[PDB]
Paper text:
PX domains have specialized protein structures involved in binding of phosphoinositides (PIs). Through binding to the various PIs PX domains provide site-specific membrane signals to modulate the intracellular localisation and biological activity of effector proteins. While all PI3Ks must interact with phosphoinositides as phosphorylation substrates within the catalytic domain active site, membrane-associated class II PI3Ks are unique in that they additionally contain PX and C2 domains appended to the C-terminus of the kinase domain. The PI3K-C2α PX domain folds into the canonical PX polypeptide chain topology comprising a three-stranded β-sheet meander that packs against a subdomain of 3 α-helices.
Residues 1490, 1491 and 1493–1496 were modelled as alanines since their side-chains were not clearly visible in the electron-density maps. This model, which we refer to here as 'structure B', was refined to an Rfactor/Rfree of 0.231/0.311. Our two new structures, A and B, are however not identical: they have two significantly different conformations of the putative PI binding region. These differences are attributed to the presence of a putative ligand in the PtdIns(4,5)P2 binding cavity in one of the crystal structures. The ligand-bound structure exhibits an 'open' conformation of the PI binding region. Structure B has a more open PI binding site with the PPII/α2 loop and β1-β2 turn presenting conformations similar to that previously seen in the yeast PX domain protein Grd19p. In structure B, the putative ligand appears to form hydrogen bonds with Arg1503, a highly conserved residue in PX domains.
Numbering used by the authors: 1421 to 1536
Write the structure that this text describes.
Amino acid sequence: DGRIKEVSVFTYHKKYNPDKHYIYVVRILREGQIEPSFVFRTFDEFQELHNKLSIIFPLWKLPGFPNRMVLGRTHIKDVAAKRKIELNSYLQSLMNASTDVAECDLVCTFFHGSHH
């Protein structure tokens, strides 16, 4: 797009600063820079990002977002490991979205500020 040239979920980990949950480490590569940046975002921030996109855009403009209640009974680390994938495909979908999605303020905010 503008600056952002590629994004990906690079890896994640199991934090305890309140109690849980996981953090997803997101690698971003901008046009104006040679080195990636990395930001850290939980499942619920990506959710909160989608929810705010829906306020201002029609859903058919946006990727679908990955949430299953519990598949059936599963499973701490296991869900983290399926989110690495699902969040990453969300991200690829969201940034090859129209320009007004890819480059809109709500999606640049999401991606500024390592922990914020």
